[PDB]
């Protein structure tokens, strides 16, 4: 069996696999990510865990893996219906929360520094702990940077629109939502997701991207729509294949967006912003420092959010289930589910 | 992790792809001294809605699957009682979920497993369901349910629709009320590629029907309203192809036991099914049940039948959920991206 702690971060589910995880081939976490995304056994495992009947169209499964850096408490990789991913703020917060509240990592009060090894690098997480509860977690995200601002693409549905290509631990296309004639709110969840899936297909087909120093991280993962609320918060809706919205404000997406703000002169070291998701849940987003990635101007972002352990689950690793290969349908998985 | 926490313990089972989580420990006391009373309570009391919402909506629940609350048996012949929690309401009856419950009771050992066969009597708000389980080496391989008395209310009820014009449906009962609709009338076939469009049609029809076509069981007032619109067809091999659509908008993954029970009553009324007959039914994902006509009977003086439904349950995991009314999202939530077109009414 695989043992999971079921956690949500600002409404976004991150199941944290804390026991019974199989050995994942690779001498680095980046190699393990590559293996998961290329080997048939990697596909089999992911499908088994994420698709029906064992998985749901919402949430990710975070595989805890052996740390390699001596300062890392654990390593992890994020499993989703599309692929394995290197990075995620909401899931890093879920992993931190699970590690501390399970006692796998010793909880110190008022703060515990937890170090998570990802394919993108080490994520340093400062957890505010009180009375055995991990209340919130401030992530120091990996160096984030602009790939290109104001990229134009032709769309049959909305004509020419512009997006920012950028990196916040995985690659994003950021789109001002007014360009597709929608607004970010709950009532538009399906239509926003439909637009995001059209854009992701177009972008993935025509706009290849790879991290200049980490070959295993490539392609635009998600299209994130952005707007501004009246109180000044960065409103976001990250669209995820085969078609659903992130329930959290999106840590990696905010990290990538913060890099665009900094490039435009709209954010500076020391600034703190609020970001709000489609459901109104919130993160604090900070610009901690400037840096460089392979000669490119870059930043060190911070993402602060809360994790809530809501349950425990154990899944039988029985490959004889008649539904062991897993399935999905467009009723609840989104418009591209037929491609699963 | 859960130290110091109040939890509900569940066995996670699927029946032909349809998830039935079975709550076997830490279920709160549900007020009522009959199961029908407990069903009414869940569907009318604020605390009932609170509990259901907490368990079935995000972040704790997903848009697929049901939560089956095991409850004390009242009837002297019953081994256990249960009620089905879904995003729309609590429901009296479910074929797939009765199979999940039986599987979980027997494999956990809560009910003693006998080989080659164990009979488990489940008490529902609709009546007793006899579950005859084929068992071997500690596994409940498959379950034949004797369903509650099923009957026709009216065949070929006409209804005007803006999209498809006037169409016909059968109003009937298989442990809950159904509108059964030949799927050619909406210009779609039942298949995985049409899941979203079938569900959209099912929801339009459910809203129209619930507004204009009240129904109530003539002897069990707690069971009322058309629960589901089920689309039906016949495959090339003669299987009864089904797609039951569930509010706020998804398809049953199973062939639908209660829906097949209601459909079998319509076949019987049409002279197309007799005592002893057996049919196969297939779901939108191609999973299958055996559907039998065991006997004729009467419900409140009306002609009825006793159907059987045979399918397989499979325990895929265990889960525990913390009952924490102080979670900031204790009220639960849903969105139209994954919950279907009527999710905004949650």
From Swiss-Prot, chain B:
<keyword id="KW-0413">Isomerase</keyword>
<dbReference type="GO" id="GO:0047580">
    <property type="term" value="F:4-hydroxyproline epimerase activity"/>
</dbReference>
<comment type="function">
    <text>Catalyzes the epimerization of trans-4-hydroxy-L-proline (t4LHyp) to cis-4-hydroxy-D-proline (c4DHyp). May be involved in a degradation pathway of t4LHyp. Can also catalyze the epimerization of trans-3-hydroxy-L-proline (t3LHyp) to cis-3-hydroxy-D-proline (c3DHyp) in vitro. Displays no proline racemase activity.</text>
</comment>
<feature type="binding site">
    <location>
        <begin position="257"/>
        <end position="258"/>
    </location>
    <ligand>
        <name>substrate</name>
    </ligand>
</feature>
<feature type="active site" description="Proton acceptor">
    <location>
        <position position="94"/>
    </location>
</feature>
<feature type="binding site">
    <location>
        <position position="86"/>
    </location>
    <ligand>
        <name>substrate</name>
    </ligand>
</feature>
<feature type="binding site">
    <location>
        <begin position="95"/>
        <end position="96"/>
    </location>
    <ligand>
        <name>substrate</name>
    </ligand>
</feature>
<dbReference type="GO" id="GO:0050346">
    <property type="term" value="F:trans-L-3-hydroxyproline dehydratase activity"/>
</dbReference>
<comment type="similarity">
    <text>Belongs to the proline racemase family.</text>
</comment>
<dbReference type="InterPro" id="IPR008794">
    <property type="entry name" value="Pro_racemase_fam"/>
</dbReference>
<feature type="binding site">
    <location>
        <position position="252"/>
    </location>
    <ligand>
        <name>substrate</name>
    </ligand>
</feature>
<feature type="active site" description="Proton donor">
    <location>
        <position position="256"/>
    </location>
</feature>
<protein>
    <recommendedName>
        <fullName>4-hydroxyproline 2-epimerase 1</fullName>
        <ecNumber>5.1.1.8</ecNumber>
    </recommendedName>
</protein>
<dbReference type="Pfam" id="PF05544">
    <property type="entry name" value="Pro_racemase"/>
</dbReference>
């Amino acid at each position: 069996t695989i043992q999971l702690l079921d956690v949500h971060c600002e409404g976004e589910i991150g199941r944290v696999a804390i026991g019974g995880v199989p050995k994942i081939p690779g001498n680095t976490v980046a190699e393990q990510l590559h293996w998961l995304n290329t080997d048939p056994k990697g596909e089999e495992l992911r499908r088994f865990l994420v698709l029906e009947p064992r998985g749901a169209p919402i949430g990710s499964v975070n595989l805890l893996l052996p740390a390699r850096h001596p300062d890392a408490d654990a390593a992890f990789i994020i499993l989703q219906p599309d692929q394995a991913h290197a990075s995620s703020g909401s899931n890093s917060i879920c992993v931190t929360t699970a590690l501390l509240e399970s006692g796998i990592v010793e909880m110190k009060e008022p703060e515990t520094v937890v170090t998570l090894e990802t394919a993108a690098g080490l994520v340093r997480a400062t957890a505010t702990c009180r009375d055995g509860r991990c209340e919130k977690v401030r992530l120091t995200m990996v160096p984030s940077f602009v790939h290109e601002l104001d990229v134009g693409i032709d769309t049959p549905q909305w004509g020419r629109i512009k997006l920012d290509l950028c990196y916040g631990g995985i690659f994003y296309a950021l789109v001002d939502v007014g360009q597709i004639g929608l607004t970010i709110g709950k009532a538009n969840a399906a239509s926003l997701v439909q637009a995001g899936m059209v854009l992701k297909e177009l972008i993935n087909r025509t706009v290849p991207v790879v991290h200049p120093e980490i070959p295993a991280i490539s392609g635009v993962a998600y299209v994130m729509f952005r707007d501004i609320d009246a109180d000044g918060a960065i409103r976001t809706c990250t669209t995820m294949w085969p078609g659903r919205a992130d329930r959290s404000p999106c840590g990696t997406g905010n990290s990538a967006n913060l890099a665009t703000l900094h490039a435009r002169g709209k954010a500076r070291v020391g600034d703190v912003f609020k970001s709000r998701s489609i459901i109104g849940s919130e993160f604090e987003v900070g610009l901690q420092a400037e840096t460089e990635v392979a000669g490119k101007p870059a930043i060190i972002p911070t993402i602060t959010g809360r994790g809530f352990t809501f349950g425990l689950s154990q899944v039988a690793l029985d490959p004889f289930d008649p539904m062991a290969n897993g399935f999905a349908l467009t009723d609840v998985w989104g418009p591209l589910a037929g491609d699963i």
